[PDB]
Design an enzyme around this catalytic site. Structure first.
Site, short mmCIF file in Angstrom:
data_model
loop_
_atom_site.label_atom_id
_atom_site.label_comp_id
_atom_site.label_asym_id
_atom_site.label_seq_id
_atom_site.Cartn_x
_atom_site.Cartn_y
_atom_site.Cartn_z
CG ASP A 77 -3.72 -4.65 2.68
OD1 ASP A 77 -3.57 -4.14 3.79
OD2 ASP A 77 -4.47 -3.94 1.86
CG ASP B 259 -10.32 -1.27 15.49
OD1 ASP B 259 -10.33 -1.29 16.81
OD2 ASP B 259 -9.99 -0.51 14.77
CG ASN C 221 -1.80 -1.09 0.98
OD1 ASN C 221 -2.27 -1.59 -0.03
ND2 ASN C 221 -2.59 -1.48 2.26
CG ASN D 55 -2.66 -2.29 6.54
OD1 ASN D 55 -2.08 -1.96 7.44
ND2 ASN D 55 -2.28 -2.27 5.35
CB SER E 92 0.86 -0.85 5.37
OG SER E 92 -0.11 -0.56 4.64
CG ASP F 283 0.25 2.79 4.61
OD1 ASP F 283 0.43 1.95 4.09
OD2 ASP F 283 -0.54 2.75 5.79
O1 LIG Z 1 -7.61 -1.81 9.11
C1 LIG Z 1 -7.77 -0.66 9.76
C2 LIG Z 1 -8.01 0.62 8.94
O2 LIG Z 1 -7.02 0.33 7.89
C3 LIG Z 1 -7.67 0.99 6.66
C4 LIG Z 1 -6.74 2.05 6.16
O3 LIG Z 1 -6.92 2.11 4.51
O4 LIG Z 1 -7.60 -0.33 5.69
C5 LIG Z 1 -6.33 -1.06 5.93
O5 LIG Z 1 -6.54 -2.34 6.51
C6 LIG Z 1 -7.49 -3.06 5.87
C7 LIG Z 1 -7.82 -4.38 6.84
O6 LIG Z 1 -6.30 -5.16 6.97
C8 LIG Z 1 -7.08 -3.63 4.38
O7 LIG Z 1 -8.06 -4.46 3.94
C9 LIG Z 1 -6.92 -2.31 3.69
O8 LIG Z 1 -6.49 -2.51 2.25
C10 LIG Z 1 -5.76 -1.27 4.32
O9 LIG Z 1 -5.97 -0.22 3.57
C11 LIG Z 1 -9.20 1.19 6.99
O10 LIG Z 1 -9.98 0.99 5.74
C12 LIG Z 1 -9.47 0.44 8.21
O11 LIG Z 1 -10.35 1.10 8.76
NA NA Z 2 5.03 -3.66 4.54
#
Ligand SMILES: OC[C@H]1O[C@@](CO)(O[C@H]2O[C@H](CO)[C@@H](O)[C@H](O)[C@H]2O)[C@@H](O)[C@@H]1O
Ligand code: NA
Ligand SMILES: [Cl-]
Ligand SMILES: [Cl-]
Ligand SMILES: [Cl-]
Ligand SMILES: [Cl-]
Ligand code: NA
Ligand code: NA
Ligand code: NA
Length: 129
Positions: free
Chosen positions: A52, A101, A46, A59, A50, A48
């Site tokens: 997935d 969450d 991603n 993530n 990070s 940032d």
């Molecule tokens: O997961 C918490 C929070 O992170 C976000 C940020 O975009 O989503 C990220 O995490 C998700 C769950 O792991 C991934 O599916 C997604 O691709 C990743 O961007 C928020 O959407 C979420 O509330």
């Molecule tokens: Na990473």
């Protein structure tokens, strides 16, 4: 592992996802389809920095540790690599934490943009469950 649609539905239901936090089985199958195309090995970096991981694209910034995401929390207390297994157990346990969450399944971008509001029951059509 590339899961079949009904195969993944049955594994998800067995692990207690059906109506978890009020989300029917079809929502989870639809989410998996668009997050990973049912492929447990799917990984995507991603913007940032990070990454997935796995069937539900969990993530590395918040949920699992991949050792390359600064500011990383590891709220599911699991190496991200463990979320790529042919056994979805760890992914499911972690997904249960994510969907609890606060924002429900909106945490999954692909679910929000491609599943939410749609006929998600279609995703389990024809399955023996
Ligand atoms: O997961 C918490 C929070 O992170 C976000 C940020 O975009 O989503 C990220 O995490 C998700 C769950 O792991 C991934 O599916 C997604 O691709 C990743 O961007 C928020 O959407 C979420 O509330
Ligand atoms: Na990473
Ligand atoms: Cl459904
Ligand atoms: Cl890290
Ligand atoms: Cl499994
Ligand atoms: Cl909700
Ligand atoms: Na695979
Ligand atoms: Na199948
Ligand atoms: Na539902």
């Amino acid at each position: 592992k590339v899961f079949g649609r009904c195969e993944l539905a049955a594994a998800m239901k067995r692990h207690g996802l059906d109506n978890y936090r009020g989300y029917s089985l079809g929502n989870w199958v639809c989410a998996a389809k668009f997050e990973s195309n049912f492929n447990t090995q799917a990984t995507n970096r991603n913007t940032d920095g990070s990454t997935d991981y796995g069937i539900l694209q969990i993530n590395s910034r918040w949920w699992c540790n991949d050792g390359r995401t600064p500011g990383s929390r590891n709220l599911c207390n699991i190496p991200c690599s463990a979320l790529l297994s042919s056994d979805i157990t760890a992914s499911v346990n972690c997904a249960k934490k994510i969907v609890s969450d606060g924002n429900g399944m909106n945490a999954w971008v692909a679910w929000r943009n491609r599943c939410k509001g749609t006929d998600v029951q279609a995703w389990i059509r024809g399955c023996r469950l």
